Design an enzyme around this catalytic site. Structure first.
Site, mmCIF file in Angstrom:
data_model
loop_
_atom_site.group_PDB
_atom_site.id
_atom_site.type_symbol
_atom_site.label_atom_id
_atom_site.label_comp_id
_atom_site.label_asym_id
_atom_site.label_seq_id
_atom_site.Cartn_x
_atom_site.Cartn_y
_atom_site.Cartn_z
ATOM 1 N N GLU A 72 -0.538 0.120 -0.740
ATOM 2 C CA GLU A 72 -1.529 0.134 0.320
ATOM 3 C C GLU A 72 -2.578 -0.940 0.066
ATOM 4 O O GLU A 72 -3.076 -1.079 -1.056
ATOM 5 C CB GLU A 72 -2.191 1.507 0.413
ATOM 6 C CG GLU A 72 -3.459 1.516 1.241
ATOM 7 C CD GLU A 72 -3.236 0.956 2.630
ATOM 8 O OE1 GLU A 72 -2.199 1.279 3.242
ATOM 9 O OE2 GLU A 72 -4.090 0.183 3.106
ATOM 10 N N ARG A 73 -2.904 -1.702 1.108
ATOM 11 C CA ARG A 73 -4.031 -2.621 1.047
ATOM 12 C C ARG A 73 -5.324 -1.828 1.173
ATOM 13 O O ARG A 73 -5.835 -1.640 2.279
ATOM 14 C CB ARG A 73 -3.926 -3.669 2.149
ATOM 15 C CG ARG A 73 -2.545 -4.276 2.274
ATOM 16 C CD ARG A 73 -2.632 -5.764 2.536
ATOM 17 N NE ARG A 73 -1.333 -6.416 2.423
ATOM 18 C CZ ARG A 73 -0.479 -6.553 3.430
ATOM 19 N NH1 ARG A 73 -0.787 -6.081 4.631
ATOM 20 N NH2 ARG A 73 0.682 -7.161 3.240
ATOM 21 N N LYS A 113 0.107 0.178 14.795
ATOM 22 C CA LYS A 113 1.134 0.927 14.083
ATOM 23 C C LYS A 113 0.610 2.300 13.711
ATOM 24 O O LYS A 113 1.242 3.333 13.967
ATOM 25 C CB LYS A 113 1.525 0.169 12.821
ATOM 26 C CG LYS A 113 1.894 -1.265 13.047
ATOM 27 C CD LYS A 113 2.539 -1.812 11.801
ATOM 28 C CE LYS A 113 3.285 -3.091 12.074
ATOM 29 N NZ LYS A 113 4.158 -3.428 10.921
#
Ligand code: ATP
Ligand code: ADP
Ligand code: MG
Ligand code: MG
Lengths: 52, 506, 174, 74, 464, 463, 52, 73
Positions: free
Chosen positions: E180-181, E154
């Protein structure tokens, strides 16, 4: 195309009046600022008392 | 130049000539364009409310000691303690024929930027339905430029008829076509945008002015980003403007777009007033909330016109036709709000997803789509030619449904299936493809005469169009005569079948 | 609201005081007790989790000193019993309003750009008696905020004559 | 904040201003306060029981089940 | 006085009283006098008291502590120097690249464009990804939701998009990371860093761990960024167009639901912020093409409960101009990009819009592919032998189409040394329509793998 | 004595009253400025009570004065109300002059005593196969049309009025309740085409009206009929009373609309908790007594087409004659679309209906039951992979369904085919002959949209 | 072509805007109108009001 | 190794708070430049207890009686 042209013409002719009014009222209110008339205040409040 | 100077001078010599007695109430509490105001007792329920910010308000709650009310526009420039006055006068809006060719604020302010327009008449927005003793039976047609629509589902002047479907399945394009049809008719037509994308808006606009329709036409918009109040209120205003001409014995036409957004917006607003909700967060009155607006459209008596205009008319029955829009989630016709609205409308139309997915544009699920009035508006030609064909194809649908898990088919089922295929292919048209009456007239004639169960499946539509060409070239006086009247005579159909044989020869 | 819940007590106290004629004494006590209420120190000391109805009642009599009555004693008592002490000053204000309307005398708020001479004052008092109170009540105010004219305030009856007119007409311009 | 009680009628308030004795005629009889939908709130009769039968000036009968601080719902 | 003091706080809620003469309007900035915590004006509780949520933690703070106002909403810097820097929600440096040099800042909560400002025309947005170029062509001021799982680059996809937009049209790009991770964000930073694409994009992440308010507002943050950039106009007017990628607006909806609970007001029907539609419109209608200049936006989205009847996707679809999905098996077939070509759909698929001939060719191609899927099952169950000959031709040609779809990329170019593929419209269509004639049945399907234009395909056939 | 407005919310009002004068719970309160009127509902006490308004809520401010009549809503009553069109206040809307009589009757009243009910044991033939077959009627019973939105609740009523009206001779009353105005006006003109227009009286309380008006609308007509039943003929009694209800669901809905504003709580769905008791109060003043016979027909809209809704559930406890509509049957194009199963009648008695009627009906339902059951598998499996008798029964039941499909005398408006009236004897004989399998060789099309069995023979031999 | 005329029209509007700046300062007399005529005249004395 | 216990019979508060403590002790050795591992048990019941507390804290109810702060936590 003609309709768009004439619409632009009328648009501008109206648009000018807005800033004209803004500047005119600013100048007029400033002029009202420069004058300091308590006597006019008194006269008009007397008139109001009449108008009540 | 100086003409503006003289104009502004005389406008200044005009007004503000004296002081004024008035009453104020200042702000107390604020949340999301919903404000609590204390200090105004002379207030009116839902009146216009004055504010130093230049905006206005509509009154909601007359309690013992303050008022809660609603903004008309954004409110970020507002704060507690500011000045807030009362107009002492109810909600209104300018109304007039001058509105034609214009798109404005939901409060009638020109968003087109084509100069403000005065309407020598202004009317209150919230009004009640007329009296029963003044209503008139629907008797006059409305043409939709369709074959599928105009034939199987008649719609006359003043009827209310919801349109329901899914996203990108052809819901508006239909109403648009209907409006364009009314060009020649000269009837009153007006549409409202309600909480949608301005891109879509300008697309609709540009299409309209391309057609030049936006000259007997007026539209107002509720933007999807506008604070929910205007979304809630706008359709009532549009109905108000529309009623002007019906109030003048003049047939009228309105198009409501996406009442679902208005419904949910109102639900939210009223819930922010902490009022308890009913099923799926909707309060009960929502049914009433929409329906009261819907009842305002009808076909009325010339007597009502005289009672309205008390000599200002000779007396002709007026009307206003209603085009509401509600979307369905996953085709749930049984959905709560749909269940409510269908109980209101004089009839409905639903569009099938798969056929549009199968390319059928439009894609009618004629199975459930009917009008309470039906054959009170169609031309005698159309009315006699139609009558059971929609039912016939509806049963053809269920026949085909049953005909996939059973291997036996009698000749009755065989003929029903084969003729249903032909008539199905017969009900196709192009986007922006209107029809004169003779068009669908000769089409249905051929169908009933079995003149289609004989020619190629795919070539059906080609034969149709070439037939239109063939006739409107050779028989142009014939179709001119028939469509100028709406009456059928047997010699006419004799000429029709003569053309049938001649074109089948070609 | 606070005012709404205050409503019954105001009319009750007004009825009682009028029935006794101590309306003056009541009202003055109300001013005092309101002042006590707004006092953060006295209130905080009052709001300690130690006081019994008798405690705060005696306290209010003490800070009241004289101008006390068995009537107001029970009044304050039951107020504490329902613990409606916070909204006391609003009750006083409404009671004042009640006496005024009962006596049809009204107050007008007067705001000016300049100091105003008395003769003007009784002139306009008379002028407003054409609006027919029983008695005008004058509250003058001088404001260079104002430039011309005097705006007035009879409860919510308000009339402007000042500079603001330019703002209104300028709105009208556009 | 506490809200209104079904006991804040200025009639009662003025009575309290007048006196703090003769408790509801020793709670032998109450007085109607709030009436709606077969449910009535009454001031007094604190002596009565939850589940005690009640007579009325209308010569009728009823059953209070709520003994509040100062009010009773019947 | 121009400041107030803390009077009560609960949860994430903060209350402060002011005097009646000085009390701020909504959204204005409020700095805790004594620490770096910042408060956002939300609604006026009256009595000088107003309710706000703090940006950051809630401890170290006790009542009575003074807190001041700026009497203005959040203003964050705008300028070209913003590129290559990662910032907090408040636009404060977090890459440790020093403070942002640009002190030119702008307010955030600002009004959606005017009706007059609605760009009077619509036209096809372009890129170099053939499946995008044809099967889901875009428009300027476009809004497309992205679909798929995980493990398809992605990020890589976005990298190629940014490279193309900066190359062909110098179109600027900004990204906002919502929920966000953190590890993944760092990895993505390094990835966009090795590629020199880093300089051409502006970075702010809202980490899901943060107080939900700032997580909410990062959207408008990047939005204002893009607004300035597009409105930032070169000579002759007509500033460049800008591109925005938004990290899983679904998370944004979740944060809205959170903060909706936080004010302690009514939880909606399914349970959401009731005002969700309005703030949707706040986002969307603030994003479009203008009369001069455009900003197009591509947004990640997850479908909760895999359902298309829950409110969030329903509201979402009101603005998705196209649909783009990612299929796992397609990547498993080594096909890149791994986009499922058949099922991703664009609203902008009309011969009125995409061009008549273009529309016809696309329709025929999708018809062929549809046929092939109807066929491959019968093949596998019955062998390719039992088909009609034209069916076999369709099989081979469709597989050729899929192979032709496989293409290297300039982002892949640095990854593995191989010239990237740049191809516009009317360059693909020529080869495609030629393929509709079956003129390459002699050409092996392999001659279409990892290749650009049809001319390159024929060159490959020559060398093969 | 007079009162003053102190708060306005929605359509519910509150007023201050002198300690001396507190009007009873049900009184007319005239707005001293306008024609607007008020009914008391709650004794809020302390000189203040709560009320609702009848008519527009606008033009209303606080502190404005209102009087009391010291009289509840008592409306003009008598035969001088026939052939006239009244408001919710029982005032002319037809503009045919003020009503003549001077007798008034309060809209409120207690229910009649247990010692006064009557044994409605008189049947009725109508001409609709499914109805006269499955739902025998008691002259004086309650007839409800359970149905969704757009199932044909109004149509089924219009046709019955046609048939019922023409088969009857005597009193009749109609009361439009919260419905489309157009349909009501059309019905009025149709009645004007007839002449029992005189025999009947009109009153419309329609959806447009404010909910306060929308609430106490039935009271008028029901009280009218109660009088006329109690209005005894000289040397006789009251006459046969024709009553027709139009979506009592509207009344329920209004009760829902008002409850929250009434300071009330929200039922398990949101209704007023008092909905059950008010529905019962409403229904109990509706009965044929020792005096007179009252025949009532009920329009029953079904919200979301759901039975398990509280209101229909309560409704069954009220309706001896239950008739239910379906959406899927209409989806099949069968007009009418009444479900055979759930619509039932307590008149279904072998000692009453005659043995053959009873047993034929039972067998019919049995056949349909098996067919519905096997629908699942036949959808799953091939129709051919089934037992032969099973398939036979399937075709039997399908032809039964078709044989129910009937044209109605007013239904030709959307079709054109002339409506039918089928004597019960033909129905019984035809259904028995089908159940005998005398027609297993006959195409199923020969039964669609027909009347009697002879029509079936004609259609088949034609086909 | 419409541009070619519209920018030159604007150029004319610059001369017009200075013109009407003077003309509206003259028109600023209408605060006397805003007054009750409290000042019959107050402005022509001070003429510093000249901007843009 | 170590283990910290939040028995079912314990007052809900300590159960609610323990996981963060164990986290802190783990971070210690993360802050000691070395590596280790932690196990989180019965987080569902943890949320249950926290919800109960919030309820007793008069806090506004959430979906499934869960204020959204739970996910934040
Ligand atoms: N007769 C037709 N033939 C082919 N296409 C058609 C036809 N009629 C309508 N369409 C297409 O249907 C498409 C989807 O409909 P459209 O976008 O106009 O509005 P909509 O169905 O109401 O959806 P939305 O929810 O976005 O408002 C349009 O792009 C239009 O081109
Ligand atoms: N007897 C009938 N046979 C066939 N179709 C009918 C019949 N009655 C009505 N329809 C159609 O069904 C529609 C719904 O009927 P109606 O009784 O008005 O429903 P509702 O319950 O909403 O009042 C009618 O408008 C008509 O088009
Ligand atoms: Mg649409
Ligand atoms: Mg109905």
């Amino acid at each position: 195309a003609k309709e768009a042209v004439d619409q632009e013409i009328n648009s501008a002719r109206e648009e000018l009046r807005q800033q004209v009014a803004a500047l005119a009222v600013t100048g007029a209110e400033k002029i009202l600022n420069q004058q300091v008339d308590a006597e006019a205040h008194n006269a008009m409040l007397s008139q109001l008392a009449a108008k009540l | 130049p100086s003409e503006i100077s003289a104009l502004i001078k005389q406008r200044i010599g005009d007004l503000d000539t004296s002081a004024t007695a008035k009453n104020e109430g200042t702000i107390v509490m604020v949340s999301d364009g919903i404000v609590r105001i204390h200090g105004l007792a002379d207030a009116m329920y839902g009146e216009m409310i004055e504010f130093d910010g230049g905006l206005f308000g509509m009154a909601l709650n007359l309690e013992q000691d303050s008022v809660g009310a609603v903004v008309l526009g954004n409110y970020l420039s507002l704060q507690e303690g500011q000045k807030a006055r009362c107009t002492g006068r109810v909600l209104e809006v300018p109304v007039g024929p001058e509105l034609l060719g214009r798109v404005v604020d939901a409060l009638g302010n020109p968003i087109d930027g084509k100069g403000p327009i005065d309407a020598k008449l202004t009317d209150a927005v919230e009004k009640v339905a007329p009296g029963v003793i003044w209503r008139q039976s629907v008797d006059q047609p409305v043409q939709t430029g369709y074959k599928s629509v105009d034939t199987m589902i008649p719609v006359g002047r003043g009827q209310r008829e919801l349109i329901i479907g899914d996203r990108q399945t052809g819901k508006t394009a239909m109403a648009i076509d209907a409006i364009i049809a009314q060009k020649n008719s000269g009837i009153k037509c007006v549409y409202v945008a309600i909480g949608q994308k301005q891109s879509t808006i300008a697309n609709v606009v540009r299409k309209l002015e391309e057609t030049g329709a936006m000259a007997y036409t007026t539209v107002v918009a509720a933007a999807a980003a506008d604070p929910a109040a205007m979304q809630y209120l706008a359709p009532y205003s549009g109905c108000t403007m529309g009623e002007y001409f019906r109030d003048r014995g003049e047939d009228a036409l309105i198009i409501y777009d996406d009442l679902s957004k208005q419904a949910v917006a109102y639900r939210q607003i009223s819930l922010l007033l902490r009022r308890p909700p009913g099923r799926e967060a909707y309060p009960g009155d929502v049914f009433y909330l929409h329906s009261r607006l819907l009842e305002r459209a009808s076909r009325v008596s010339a007597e009502y016109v005289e009672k309205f205009t008390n000599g200002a008319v000779t007396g002709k029955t007026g009307s206003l036709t209603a085009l509401p829009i509600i979307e369905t989630q996953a085709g749930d016709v049984s959905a709560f709000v749909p269940t409510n609205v269908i109980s209101i409308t004089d009839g409905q139309i639903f569009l099938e997803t798969s056929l549009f997915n199968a390319g059928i544009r439009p894609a009618v699920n004629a199975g459930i789509s009917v009008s309470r009035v039906g054959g009170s508006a169609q031309t005698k030609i159309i009315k006699k030619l139609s009558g059971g064909i929609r039912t016939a194809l509806a049963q053809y649908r269920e026949l085909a449904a049953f005909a996939q898990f059973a291997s036996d088919l009698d000749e009755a089922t065989r003929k029903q299936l084969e003729h249903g295929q032909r008539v199905t292919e017969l009900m196709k048209q192009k986007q922006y493809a209107p029809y004169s009456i003779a068009d669908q007239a000769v089409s249905v004639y051929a169908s009933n005469e079995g003149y289609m169960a004989d020619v190629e499946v795919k070539k059906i539509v080609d034969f149709d169009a070439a037939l239109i060409a063939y006739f409107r070239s050779e028989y142009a006086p014939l179709m001119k005569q028939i469509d100028e009247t709406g009456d059928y005579n047997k010699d006419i159909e004799a000429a029709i079948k003569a053309g049938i044989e001649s074109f089948k020869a070609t | 609201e606070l005012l709404t819940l205050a409503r019954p007590y105001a009319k009750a106290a007004f009825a009682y005081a009028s029935e006794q004629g101590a309306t003056d004494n009541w009202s003055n006590a109300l001013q005092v007790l309101s002042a006590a209420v707004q006092d953060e120190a006295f209130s905080a000391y009052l709001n300690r989790p130690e006081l019994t109805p008798a405690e705060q009642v005696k306290l209010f009599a003490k800070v009241l000193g004289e101008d006390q009555s068995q009537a107001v004693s029970n009044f304050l008592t039951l107020l504490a019993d329902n613990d409606r002490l916070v909204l006391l000053p609003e009750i006083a204000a409404e009671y004042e309003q009640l006496k005024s309307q009962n006596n049809n005398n009204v107050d007008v708020v007067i705001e000016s750009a300049f100091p105003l001479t008395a003769e003007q004052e009784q002139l306009l008092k008379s002028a407003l008696e054409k609006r027919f109170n029983s008695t005008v009540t004058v509250s003058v105010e001088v404001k260079p905020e104002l430039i011309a004219g005097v705006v007035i305030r009879a409860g919510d009856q308000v009339i402007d004559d000042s500079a603001l007119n330019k703002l209104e007409k300028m709105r009208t311009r556009l | 904040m506490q809200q209104l009680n079904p006991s804040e009628i200025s009639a009662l308030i003025k009575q309290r201003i007048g006196d703090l004795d003769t408790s509801a005629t020793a709670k032998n009889e109450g007085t109607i306060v709030m009436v709606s939908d077969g449910i009535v709130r009454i001031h007094g009769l604190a002596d009565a029981m939850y589940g005690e039968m009640i007579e009325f000036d209308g010569g009728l009968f009823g059953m209070a089940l709520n003994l509040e601080q100062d009010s009773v719902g019947a | 006085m121009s400041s107030g003091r803390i009077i009560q706080i609960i949860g994430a809620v903060i209350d402060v009283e002011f005097e009646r003469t000085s009390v701020p309007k909504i959204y204005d900035a409020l700095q805790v006098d004594g620490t770096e915590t910042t408060l956002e004006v939300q609604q006026q509780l009256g009595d000088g008291v107003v309710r706000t949520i703090a940006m950051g933690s809630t401890e170290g703070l006790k009542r009575g502590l003074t807190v001041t106002s700026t009497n203005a909403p959040i203003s964050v810097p705008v300028g070209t120097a913003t590129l290559g820097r990662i910032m907090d929600v408040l636009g404060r440096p977090i890459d440790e690249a020093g403070p942002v040099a640009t002190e030119e800042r702008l307010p955030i909560h600002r009004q959606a464009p005017s009706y007059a400002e609605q760009a009077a025309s619509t036209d096809l947005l372009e890129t170099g990804i053939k499946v995008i170029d044809l099967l889901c062509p875009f428009a300027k001021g476009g809004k497309v939701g992205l679909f798929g799982g995980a493990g398809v680059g992605k990020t890589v996809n976005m990298m190629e998009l940014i490279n193309n937009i900066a190359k062909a049209h110098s179109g600027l790009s900004v990204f906002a990371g919502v929920g966000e991770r953190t590890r993944e964000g760092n990895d993505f930073y390094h990835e966009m860093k090795d590629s020199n694409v880093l300089d051409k994009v502006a970075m702010v992440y809202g980490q899901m761990n943060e107080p939900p308010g700032n997580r909410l507002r990062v959207a408008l943050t990047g939005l204002t960024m893009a607004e300035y950039f597009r409105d930032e106009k070169d000579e002759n007017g007509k500033g460049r167009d800008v591109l925005l990628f938004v990290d899983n607006i679904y998370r944004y909806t979740l944060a809205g639901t959170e903060v909706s609970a936080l004010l302690g007001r009514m939880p909606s029907a399914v349970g959401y912020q009731p005002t969700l539609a309005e703030e949707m419109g706040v986002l969307q209608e603030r994003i479009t093409s203008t009369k001069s200049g455009s900003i197009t936006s591509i947004q990640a989205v997850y479908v909760p409960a895999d359902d298309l009847t829950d409110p969030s996707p329903a509201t979402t679809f009101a603005h998705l101009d196209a649909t783009v999905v990612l299929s796992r098996d397609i990547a498993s077939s080594g096909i890149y990009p791994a986009i499922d070509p058949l099922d991703s759909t664009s609203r902008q698929l009309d011969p009125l819009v995409v061009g008549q001939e273009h529309y016809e060719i696309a329709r025929a191609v999708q018809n062929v592919l549809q046929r092939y899927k109807e066929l491959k099952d019968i093949i596998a169950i019955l062998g390719m032998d039992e088909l009609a000959e034209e069916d076999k031709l369709v099989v081979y040609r469709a597989r050729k189409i899929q192979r032709f779809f496989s293409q290297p990329f300039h982002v892949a170019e640095v990854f593995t040394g191989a010239p990237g593929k740049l191809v516009p419209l009317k360059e693909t269509i020529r080869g495609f329509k030629g393929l509709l004639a079956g003129e390459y049945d002699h050409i092996p399907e392999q001659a279409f793998y990892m290749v650009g234009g049809i001319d390159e395909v024929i060159a490959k056939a020559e060398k093969l």
